Design a binder for this molecule. Structure first.
Ligand SMILES: [Cu+2]
Ligand SMILES: [Cu+2]
Length: 310
């Protein structure tokens, strides 16, 4: 969208609601694949609920945008190069937009809990500029996201279930290596509505499942070379006490000379699956993780799909 000007990025709408217009401050990338970040302090100290996200992205120039909640942005300037990092503390992902992926909307009555004693005090926006031939005119870009906040307690609360491999060793050559993740779910019900997969270049497919009475129910399955937005869960699924959450990342050892382990760099690999959920407010957890493989023998009946590329 056009460069806002000087209207004010905080718009109070009533006693309980306010819009945050979180936009780049007229930036002009000089090279392709630039990552720009900015932050905005939540303008209340008490608990609030993020209940809507409207993307304001120039189709021409923005490849993707991420919105994070945290307490300690990686820098304090109007904007900053953030190949490096977004937050010094944990970056909680709230929103992802990708040029060609269709953005999931929050289900009705769902919000992310922010502010107050334990919630995020800051939003950090990351904008990825790809092709920059649209900046030949040295024009200024004000891309970002318009966020709707309310102080009204929401009946459903959004969270993030992160499933992540730690021990995986990918030998050189080995055409096929599986990174398997599984945890017992022991909490009140979560309703899974979106997922995001992330690996590095050696990743062929990522799938996650809820397993109940030996039945595998697809949460999501994605080639991890495609853009990394939140894809909608095709048939949104309850995950309940006694279920097993199970994920498999399929890896190759080809194009590589030494053994590849898990690490933050691209020479290292990752197997991450982000599951966006909601829970009933009176039971809600904003975050859960699985870094174990508690039921490795259960993978003997994983569906065929998990082992074949798309
Ligand atoms: Cu991108
Ligand atoms: Cu990574």
């Amino acid at each position: 969208n056009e460069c806002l000007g000087t209207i004010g990025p905080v718009t109070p709408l009533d006693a309980s609601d306010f819009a945050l217009d979180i936009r780049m401050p007229g930036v002009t990338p000089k090279e392709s694949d630039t990552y720009f970040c900015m932050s905005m302090r939540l303008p209340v100290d008490e608990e609030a609920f993020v209940i809507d996200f409207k993307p304001r992205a120039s189709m021409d120039t923005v490849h993707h945008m991420l919105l994070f909640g945290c307490n300690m942005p990686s820098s304090t300037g109007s904007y900053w190069f953030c190949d490096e990092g977004t937050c010094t503390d944990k970056a909680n992902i709230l929103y992802a937009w990708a040029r060609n992926a269709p953005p999931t909307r929050l289900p009705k009555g769902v919000g992310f809990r922010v502010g107050g004693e334990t919630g995020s005090k800051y939003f950090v926006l990351q904008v990825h500029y790809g092709d920059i031939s649209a900046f030949r005119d040295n024009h200024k870009d004000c891309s970002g996201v318009s966020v709707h906040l309310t102080r009204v307690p929401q009946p459903l609360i959004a969270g993030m279930y992160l499933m992540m491999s730690v021990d995986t060793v990918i030998p050189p050559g080995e055409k096929v290596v599986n990174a398997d993740i599984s945890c017992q779910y022991k909490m009140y019900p979560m309703h899974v509505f979106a997922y995001r997969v992330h690996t590095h270049h050696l990743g062929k497919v990522v799938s996650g499942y809820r397993v109940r009475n030996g039945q595998w129910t697809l949460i999501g399955r994605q080639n991890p070379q495609l853009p990394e937005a939140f894809y909608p869960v095709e048939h949104p699924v309850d995950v309940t006490f006694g279920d097993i959450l199970a994920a498999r990342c399929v890896f190759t050892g080809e194009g590589r000379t030494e053994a590849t382990h898990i690490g933050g760099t691209s020479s290292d690999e990752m197997c991450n699956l982000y599951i966006m959920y909601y829970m009933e407010a009176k039971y809600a957890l904003s975050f859960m993780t699985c870094t174990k493989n508690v039921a490795p023998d259960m993978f003997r009946t994983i569906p065929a799909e998990a082992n074949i590329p798309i």
